[PDB]
Design a protein around this ligand. Structure first.
Ligand SMILES: OC[C@H]1O[C@H](OC[C@H]2O[C@H](O[C@]3(CO)O[C@H](CO)[C@@H](O)[C@@H]3O)[C@H](O)[C@@H](O)[C@@H]2O)[C@H](O)[C@@H](O)[C@H]1O
Ligand SMILES: OC[C@H]1O[C@H](OC[C@H]2O[C@H](O[C@]3(CO)O[C@H](CO)[C@@H](O)[C@@H]3O)[C@H](O)[C@@H](O)[C@@H]2O)[C@H](O)[C@@H](O)[C@H]1O
Ligand SMILES: OC[C@H]1O[C@H](OC[C@H]2O[C@H](O[C@]3(CO)O[C@H](CO)[C@@H](O)[C@@H]3O)[C@H](O)[C@@H](O)[C@@H]2O)[C@H](O)[C@@H](O)[C@H]1O
Ligand SMILES: OC[C@H]1O[C@H](OC[C@H]2O[C@H](O[C@]3(CO)O[C@H](CO)[C@@H](O)[C@@H]3O)[C@H](O)[C@@H](O)[C@@H]2O)[C@H](O)[C@@H](O)[C@H]1O
Ligand SMILES: OC[C@H]1O[C@H](OC[C@H]2O[C@H](O[C@]3(CO)O[C@H](CO)[C@@H](O)[C@@H]3O)[C@H](O)[C@@H](O)[C@@H]2O)[C@H](O)[C@@H](O)[C@H]1O
Ligand SMILES: OC[C@H]1O[C@H](OC[C@H]2O[C@H](O[C@]3(CO)O[C@H](CO)[C@@H](O)[C@@H]3O)[C@H](O)[C@@H](O)[C@@H]2O)[C@H](O)[C@@H](O)[C@H]1O
Ligand SMILES: OC[C@H]1O[C@H](OC[C@H]2O[C@H](O[C@]3(CO)O[C@H](CO)[C@@H](O)[C@@H]3O)[C@H](O)[C@@H](O)[C@@H]2O)[C@H](O)[C@@H](O)[C@H]1O
Ligand SMILES: OC[C@H]1O[C@H](OC[C@H]2O[C@H](O[C@]3(CO)O[C@H](CO)[C@@H](O)[C@@H]3O)[C@H](O)[C@@H](O)[C@@H]2O)[C@H](O)[C@@H](O)[C@H]1O
Ligand SMILES: OC[C@H]1O[C@H](OC[C@H]2O[C@H](O[C@]3(CO)O[C@H](CO)[C@@H](O)[C@@H]3O)[C@H](O)[C@@H](O)[C@@H]2O)[C@H](O)[C@@H](O)[C@H]1O
Ligand SMILES: OC[C@H]1O[C@H](OC[C@H]2O[C@H](O[C@]3(CO)O[C@H](CO)[C@@H](O)[C@@H]3O)[C@H](O)[C@@H](O)[C@@H]2O)[C@H](O)[C@@H](O)[C@H]1O
Ligand SMILES: OC[C@H]1O[C@H](OC[C@H]2O[C@H](O[C@]3(CO)O[C@H](CO)[C@@H](O)[C@@H]3O)[C@H](O)[C@@H](O)[C@@H]2O)[C@H](O)[C@@H](O)[C@H]1O
Ligand SMILES: OC[C@H]1O[C@H](OC[C@H]2O[C@H](O[C@]3(CO)O[C@H](CO)[C@@H](O)[C@@H]3O)[C@H](O)[C@@H](O)[C@@H]2O)[C@H](O)[C@@H](O)[C@H]1O
Ligand SMILES: OC[C@H]1O[C@H](OC[C@H]2O[C@H](O[C@]3(CO)O[C@H](CO)[C@@H](O)[C@@H]3O)[C@H](O)[C@@H](O)[C@@H]2O)[C@H](O)[C@@H](O)[C@H]1O
Ligand SMILES: OC[C@H]1O[C@H](OC[C@H]2O[C@H](O[C@]3(CO)O[C@H](CO)[C@@H](O)[C@@H]3O)[C@H](O)[C@@H](O)[C@@H]2O)[C@H](O)[C@@H](O)[C@H]1O
Ligand SMILES: OC[C@H]1O[C@H](OC[C@H]2O[C@H](O[C@]3(CO)O[C@H](CO)[C@@H](O)[C@@H]3O)[C@H](O)[C@@H](O)[C@@H]2O)[C@H](O)[C@@H](O)[C@H]1O
Ligand SMILES: OC[C@H]1O[C@H](OC[C@H]2O[C@H](O[C@]3(CO)O[C@H](CO)[C@@H](O)[C@@H]3O)[C@H](O)[C@@H](O)[C@@H]2O)[C@H](O)[C@@H](O)[C@H]1O
Ligand SMILES: OC[C@H]1O[C@H](OC[C@H]2O[C@H](O[C@]3(CO)O[C@H](CO)[C@@H](O)[C@@H]3O)[C@H](O)[C@@H](O)[C@@H]2O)[C@H](O)[C@@H](O)[C@H]1O
Ligand SMILES: OC[C@H]1O[C@H](OC[C@H]2O[C@H](O[C@]3(CO)O[C@H](CO)[C@@H](O)[C@@H]3O)[C@H](O)[C@@H](O)[C@@H]2O)[C@H](O)[C@@H](O)[C@H]1O
Ligand SMILES: OC[C@H]1O[C@H](O)[C@H](O)[C@@H](O)[C@H]1O
Ligand SMILES: OC[C@H]1O[C@H](O)[C@H](O)[C@@H](O)[C@H]1O
Ligand SMILES: [Ca+2]
Lengths: 150, 150, 150, 150, 150, 150, 150, 150
C-alpha cells in the first residue's frame, strides 16, 4: 500500500522501468537511473511471510526474472510483467540491504559497478558485495528509509 | 495520450469525480453530471487484452470498486484511487456499450434511471439494460465515438 | 501492427485464403482450414474508431465482400483484394466474438455449421449465433486472445 | 496486530515474562522457557521503519533494558515495563534472525548457551552468534514463521 | 484414495479427458487443458510397488496406451478405458517429475512443446526432457504437491 | 506401516543399527551389514508429501544427522535418536534409488565403496554416484522392491 | 533383559494375551488370568526416561491402546501390536503401583472389580483406585517385586 | 552409572554436601544450594528392586541418616558416609517426585519451606507435601529428567 523508491545504495541511482513509462509493456527491462518521478515508484505485495511481489506502482506490473524460471541463472535480466506466479517472488531484506529472489540470487546492476551509469541493466546474480546493495526510501525524502512490509 | 469522455448513453450525462476536482482524493465517488470539462476526462491503460485501468486524466487516479474486493456485490460504490491492482480491472465494451468489471458486473447509475439527475452516484450491478449503457466520445465532440484501446 | 489468427470459435478452425498462398490473387476466396502457418496470419489496420481493414499479413491484401458493394446481401462471398476503400471496412468485436462489416452483416462459414469442414467458404450473413463467432489469438498460442486494435 | 512466539532458534525455547503472568509487574525479567501459552505471545508495534516496541500481548507491557538507558551496557537485563519511549525501541531482524536494540546490541540468553535452561534471563549483549538468534513463529504452529511487521 | 491434478510442469495445463465428461467413453483421448474442475481429477491405484493404474476420478476409467499393447511405440495416443490389465501399468515418478509406462516410455504432449495448446493430445514417447515433466498437485491448491502413493 | 530392508544396491549389504539392538541407545551409528534380522527392519513415517522419518522398526527410533542440524556438512554421521523434528526429514527416492535429506545431501557409505565391509559407517554427502544407491526390499525377499510410502 | 509378570494387586490375577499364545496376532486383547507361564511374561523397553514399551516376551509384540490413538477415551481396549510409536508409550509406576499411558489414563480391568474373573478384558480408564493397581513380580516368585526399568 | 543432579522441585535448588568438597568428611551434612558443579553430582547404586544407595559422585560416599539407625525419627539429619549397609537404603520415587528411606520417611529441607535459603540442612521427615519433592535431572540440562535406575 505504501510506495517507496528502490535506491542503489552505492550510487544513489534508482530502479527504473527502461523508458520511464507509467504503463511499460510486458518484458520491459529494469534499469538504474538517477531520476525521480512517480513512474519509478514501487510497492511490495506480501504473499508468504517475507516473500512477495515487487510491483511498479504506476502500472501494477511486477518484477520477474526474464523467462520466469524458478532457479534463473546468473545474468538473467530483470523485467516487468503482469503475470503473478511463484517464480516472481522476492524478499526485501532491509537489514542486510539487498533484494533476494525466492531461489537465492540477488538483484545486481549488470557489471557490478558501485557507480553504474544511467540505463544500466539489472540482473540476477548470487554474489554479495557493496554494489548489489539497495535501500528502500520515501518518495518525498530519498534519504528516509521506509518499511516496505507495511 | 488518448482522452475520452464516459457518456451515459440514455441521458447524455457524463462520469465525473464528485466535486469536479483535478486532484480527487482516494475513495472519491464517481457521479454522473451534465457538465463537460478537463476534470472529467478519462484515459484507458490496457493491461491484458480487453482488461485495463480506467484512469482520471487530470489526477492519474483510477476507478475502483469501493473497498477493492475481487467480487464486489451489487450497489458497491465506484471510487477513484491511486492503487493499481487486478481488482480495479475493467473492460470498455464499445460494441455492447457498457463498462464491465473483471468479476462480471457492470457500472450502473445508482437506481438505474435512464435520466439520473446530476450528482447521482455510480455502482456495480449485475443487470444488463438500457440505463447502464455507456459510450466513449471525444472531449471536443460529445457525439463522436473514439477508440479507447489506442 | 499486431499479428493474430482468426479462429472460428465453435470449430477451432482458422480463416485462410483458399490455397494458402503468400500472395493470393485478387478475389481469392477466404475459407476455414485447420492448419496453422504464416500464410494465415492476419493484422488489423484501424481507420475510424472501431472500423478498419482486416489484412492478410503475407500479401498485404485485405478482406472484401466480393464485388466491393457497400451493402452486400446475405451469402456474399468474402475475398482478398489489394484495394483500400470504405466498403472493405470491418470491426473486430472481441466482446461478442464476431466480425462485423460496415453495413451490419457478419462473417459466417457458408452453411452456418459449428463444425465446418476444411475449405468451407466464408460469406456475409446477418444472423448472429454460435457458428459465426470468431476469436483473435496469438500465432504462438492459439488459446491466448490478443488485442487487435493496436 | 499479528501475534507471534519469539522462539530461541538454537534451543526451541521461547521468550516468557518471569512467572508467566498475564499482568507481570513493571521491571519483571524476561526469561526463556519451553512452555507455550497465551501469556508468552508477543506483538510488534512499528514506530519508525524497522524500529518499534516488542509488546507482551496479555499485558500490553513492552520490552525494556532494565533502567531504560539509551545505550545500555552488555549484560543489561531485559524487562517488561508499561512505559513507551525511544529507549525501548527494537528491530525484529527476520533475515539474520536476531533482535537488535536501537543502540546496536542484541537480545541474548544470559551466558550465551545454545541450550539455556528454563528461567534463564535475557540480557543485552553486543556479540552476534548462533545462540542469540531468534525466529518469530505462529502461536498455533511453532515451526511456521510469521511476518511481524504486519 | 488421494485425489490430485496432473499438471504439465512447463505450461501449467492439466491432463483432461477429451471433452471433459464425467463418463468419457472407452478410448477417449487424454489431452492437456488449462481448466480445473472435478472431471479432470485423478487418483492412483497401486498394484505392485511403483506400478499402478492412473484413474480418472469421475468415471473410474484408467489410462491406457491406445490399443493396449505391452510395448507401445512412440506417438501411441493415451486414452481412457475401463479395462484393468498389465499394459495399463504406470509409475508416478514424483522425484524426476514424469509418468513412465511399464515398458519404459513416458507420457508426452504430442509435439513436445513447453506450451502445448488446449486439446493437445498426449502420447507415449521415449524422450526425457522439460516438455514431458508432470507434477501431482492438490485439487484445492494447484501449486501444492501431494503424495499419490496413498 | 510397511516394513522393509534398506539395501545398499552395489554391495547387497543393509542398513543396520551398529550393534543389532532391538532398542539401541540414542546416537547409535547407522552402519552397513550383510546380516538380515528383524532388528534391521525399517519403516517410513510420512510427514509432508515425499518427506518423512526413517524409523528403526524394533525401537521406534528414527534416523538423524548427528547433531540434528538443518544443513549438516559432508561426512556427518547418521545415527538413531528418539527425537522427532524437521531436521530428521528424509525422502526415499525409489526411482533414482537413493535416500535424500531435507537439505539436499544423500546417505552414503563412509568412503564411497561399491563393496563396503561390515560395520562401515554411513554419512551425509552431496555427491551422486553408484555407491550411494539404495533400494528398499521385502524382509521375506531381499530382491523384491516394496513401496515405502504405504 | 528383565522379565516380569504384571500382577493385578487386588486379585492376584495376571495380564495375559487373550488365548495364551506365544505369537498373539496384532490387536489381540490383553486379559486378566490366574495362570502363570512363559507366554504371559513381559519385558519393558525404556524409550524416554519413564516412558517405554510394554513388551510381550514370547512374541516381541508391545501393548497398544486399540486403534493407536494418542489420547484414547475411557474403555479403550488394550491389545498387542508389533508397531513401535509414541502412542504405545507407557510408564510402569512401581511406587503408586499402576501403569500409566503417555496421555495420562491408566490400565484397568474392564468394570473395575477387585476380583475380576479370568478372560476379563483390560481397558484404558482415567480413574485411580484400588482395583487398577498392578505390581511387577518375578516369574519364578509371584510376590517378589522386580525392577522393570533396566 | 547414570549421573544426575538432585533438584528441589519447589525452589530449583540442589542437594549439596555442606561446603561443596570433592571429598566430604564422613557425617558431613547434606544441604540445599543453588550452585551447579561436579561436586554436587549424584549417582544411584541399585541394591534391591527400588532400594539402592544415593552416591555422591565426587567422593563415592553415600547418603545416610546420621547415626545409621534403621528407623530414624523425624528431624534426623542427612549426611554423607562411606559405609555401605541396609540402613542407608533409599528409593528414588520419580513418579511422586520424592526420596524415601527404607523405613518410610522422606528427605526434606529442614523446616519444609518451598523456597529455603542456601545452606539449609536436610532431614528425614514423614510428611508429604510440595516442599519435600525432588526431581532428578541431567548435569547438562537441569530441566531434563533422567532415569536414575539405569
Ligand atoms: O519475462 C517474464 C515472463 O516469463 C515467461 O514468459 C516469457 C514470455 O512468454 C511469451 O513470449 C513468447 C512469445 O509469445 O513465448 C515464447 C516462450 O518461449 C517465446 O518465444 C516468447 O518470449 C509471452 O507471450 C510473453 O509475454 C512472456 O514474457 C513467463 O511465462 C511469464 O509468466 C513471465 O514470468
Ligand atoms: O553482472 C553481475 C555481476 O557484475 C560483476 O561481474 C561482471 C562481470 O561478469 C563476468 O565476468 C566474470 C567472469 O564470468 O564474472 C565474475 C563476477 O561474477 C568476474 O569476476 C569475472 O570477470 C563477465 O564476463 C564480465 O564481462 C563482467 O564484467 C560483479 O563482479 C559480480 O559480482 C556481479 O555483480
Ligand atoms: O476502495 C478502493 C481501495 O480499497 C482498499 O483501500 C480502502 C481504504 O483503506 C483505508 O480506509 C479505511 C481506514 O481504515 O480502511 C478500511 C478498508 O480496509 C475502511 O474501513 C476505511 O475506509 C485507507 O485509509 C484508504 O486510503 C483506502 O482507500 C484497497 O486496499 C485499495 O487497494 C483500493 O482498492
Ligand atoms: O443501482 C443500480 C440498479 O438500480 C435499480 O435497482 C435498484 C433496486 O434494487 C433493489 O430492488 C430490487 C431487488 O434487487 O431490484 C430489482 C430491479 O433490479 C427489483 O425487482 C427489486 O426492487 C433494491 O432493494 C431497491 O431499493 C432498488 O430500487 C435497477 O433496477 C437495477 O437494474 C440497477 O440499475
Ligand atoms: O485453403 C487453405 C489451405 O490452403 C492450402 O491447402 C490447400 C489444399 O492443398 C493440399 O491438398 C491438396 C493436395 O495437394 O491440394 C489440392 C488443392 O486444389 C487438393 O486437391 C488437395 O487436398 C494441402 O495438403 C491441403 O491441406 C489443402 O486442403 C494450404 O496447404 C493449407 O495449409 C491451407 O492454408
Ligand atoms: O471483390 C472485391 C473488389 O470488388 C470490386 O472489383 C471487382 C472486380 O472487378 C473487375 O473484375 C470483373 C471483370 O473484369 O468485373 C466484375 C465486377 O465489376 C467481376 O465480376 C469481374 O471479376 C476487376 O478486373 C477486378 O480486379 C475486380 O476485383 C472493387 O472495385 C474492388 O475495389 C474490390 O472491392
Ligand atoms: O451461410 C451462412 C448461413 O448458413 C445457414 O443458412 C443457410 C441456409 O440459408 C437459406 O435457408 C433459409 C431459408 O431461406 O434461410 C434462413 C437463414 O439462414 C434459414 O433459417 C433457412 O434455412 C438457404 O435457402 C438454405 O438452403 C441454407 O441452408 C445458417 O442457418 C445461417 O444462420 C447462416 O449462418
Ligand atoms: O517464568 C516463565 C514460566 O512461569 C511459570 O512457571 C514458573 C515455574 O513453575 C514451576 O516451577 C515451580 C515449582 O514447580 O513453580 C513455581 C511457579 O513460579 C516456581 O517458583 C517453581 O520453580 C515449573 O516447574 C517451572 O517449569 C517454571 O519455571 C509458568 O507456569 C510457565 O508456563 C512459564 O511461563
Ligand atoms: O527498567 C525500565 C524502566 O526504566 C526506568 O524506570 C526505572 C524504574 O524507576 C523507578 O524504580 C526505582 C524505584 O523508585 O527507581 C530507580 C531508578 O530511578 C530504580 O532503581 C528502582 O527500580 C520506577 O518507580 C519504576 O517504575 C521504574 O521501573 C524508566 O524511567 C522507565 O521508562 C523504563 O524504561
Ligand atoms: O477436452 C477437455 C475440455 O473439454 C471441455 O471443453 C471443450 C472445449 O469447450 C469449448 O469449445 C467448444 C465449445 O463448447 O467445445 C468444442 C470441443 O472441441 C469446440 O468445438 C468448441 O470450441 C472451449 O472453447 C474450449 O476451450 C474447450 O476445449 C471442458 O469444458 C473443458 O473444461 C475441458 O475439460
Ligand atoms: O485402447 C485401450 C484398449 O485397447 C484394447 O482394446 C482396443 C479396442 O478394441 C476394439 O476397438 C476397435 C474397433 O472395434 O478394435 C480394433 C482393435 O482390435 C481397433 O482398431 C478399434 O479400437 C474394441 O471395440 C474397444 O472396446 C477396445 O478399446 C484392449 O483390448 C483394451 O483392454 C484396452 O487396453
Ligand atoms: O510427441 C512428443 C515428442 O515431440 C517431439 O518430437 C516430435 C517430432 O518427432 C519426430 O521428429 C524427430 C525426427 O525423427 O524425432 C525426434 C524425437 O523422436 C526429434 O528430435 C526429431 O525432430 C517426427 O519425425 C516429427 O514429425 C515430430 O515433430 C519431441 O522432440 C520429442 O522429444 C517428444 O516430446
Ligand atoms: O544426533 C541426533 C540429535 O542431535 C541433537 O542432539 C544432540 C545431543 O544432545 C544432547 O547431548 C548433549 C549432552 O547432553 O547435548 C548437547 C546438545 O544440546 C551436545 O553437545 C551433547 O551431546 C542429548 O543428550 C543427546 O541425546 C543428543 O544426541 C538434537 O538436539 C536431537 O534432537 C537429535 O536430533
Ligand atoms: O565417505 C563419503 C565419500 O566417500 C568417498 O569420498 C571420500 C572423500 O574423497 C575425496 O576426499 C579425499 C581425497 O580422496 O579423501 C579423504 C577423505 O576420505 C580426504 O582426506 C581427501 O580430501 C573427496 O574430495 C570427498 O568427496 C570425499 O570425502 C566418495 O568418493 C564420495 O563420493 C563419498 O561417497
Ligand atoms: O472399566 C474400567 C472402569 O470400571 C468401572 O466403570 C465402569 C462403569 O462404566 C460405565 O458407567 C459409567 C456411566 O456410563 O461410567 C463411569 C465411569 O467411572 C461410571 O461412574 C458410570 O457407572 C458403564 O456403563 C457402567 O455399567 C460401569 O459401572 C469403574 O467405575 C471405573 O473406575 C473403571 O475401573
Ligand atoms: O554448601 C554448599 C556450597 O559449598 C560451597 O560454598 C560454601 C561457602 O559459601 C560461602 O563462600 C562463598 C563466598 O561467600 O559462597 C559461594 C557459594 O554460595 C562460594 O562460591 C564462595 O566460596 C561462605 O563464605 C563459606 O563460608 C562457605 O563455606 C560451594 O562453593 C558452593 O558451590 C556449594 O556447593
Ligand atoms: O552417620 C551415619 C553413620 O552412622 C554410624 O556411624 C556413626 C559414627 O560412629 C562413630 O562416631 C562416634 C564416636 O566414635 O560414635 C557415635 C555414634 O555411635 C558418634 O556420636 C561419634 O561421632 C564413628 O567414629 C564415626 O566414623 C561414625 O560416623 C554407622 O555405624 C555408619 O555406618 C553410618 O551409617
Ligand atoms: O523439618 C521438616 C518439616 O518441617 C516443617 O515442620 C517443622 C515444625 O516441626 C515441629 O512443629 C510441629 C509441632 O511441634 O510438628 C509438626 C511437623 O510437621 C508441625 O505440623 C507442627 O508445627 C516443630 O516443633 C516446629 O518448631 C517446626 O516448625 C514442616 O511443617 C514439615 O512438613 C516438615 O517439612
Ligand atoms: O432490472 C431492472 C431494470 O428494469 C428496466 O430495465 C429499467 O429500464 C431499469 O431502470 C431497471 O429498473
Ligand atoms: O469410580 C468408580 C470406582 O469407585 C470406587 O473408587 C471403587 O473403589 C472402584 O472399584 C470403582 O468402581
Ligand atoms: Ca466400449
Amino acid at each position: 500500500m505504501t510506495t517507496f523508491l528502490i535506491k542503489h545504495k552505492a550510487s544513489g541511482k534508482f530502479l527504473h522501468p527502461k523508458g520511464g513509462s507509467s504503463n511499460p509493456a510486458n518484458d520491459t527491462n529494469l534499469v538504474l537511473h538517477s531520476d525521480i518521478h512517480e513512474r519509478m515508484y514501487f510497492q511490495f505485495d506480501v504473499v508468504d511471510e517475507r516473500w512477495g511481489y515487487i510491483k511498479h506502482a504506476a502500472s501494477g506490473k511486477i518484477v520477474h526474472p526474464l523467462g520466469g524460471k524458478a532457479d534463473p541463472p546468473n545474468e538473467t535480466k530483470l523485467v516487468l510483467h503482469q503475470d503473478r506466479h511463484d517464480r516472481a517472488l522476492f524478499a526485501m531484506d532491509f537489514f542486510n540491504d539487498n533484494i533476494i529472489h525466492k531461489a537465492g540470487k540477488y538483484i545486481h546492476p549488470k557489471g557490478g559497478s558501485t557507480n553504474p551509469p544511467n540505463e544500466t541493466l539489472t540482473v540476477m546474480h548470487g554474489d554479495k558485495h557493496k554494489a548489489m546493495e539497495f535501500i528502500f526510501v520515501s518518495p518525498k525524502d530519498k534519504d528516509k528509509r521506509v518499511l516496505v512490509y507495511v
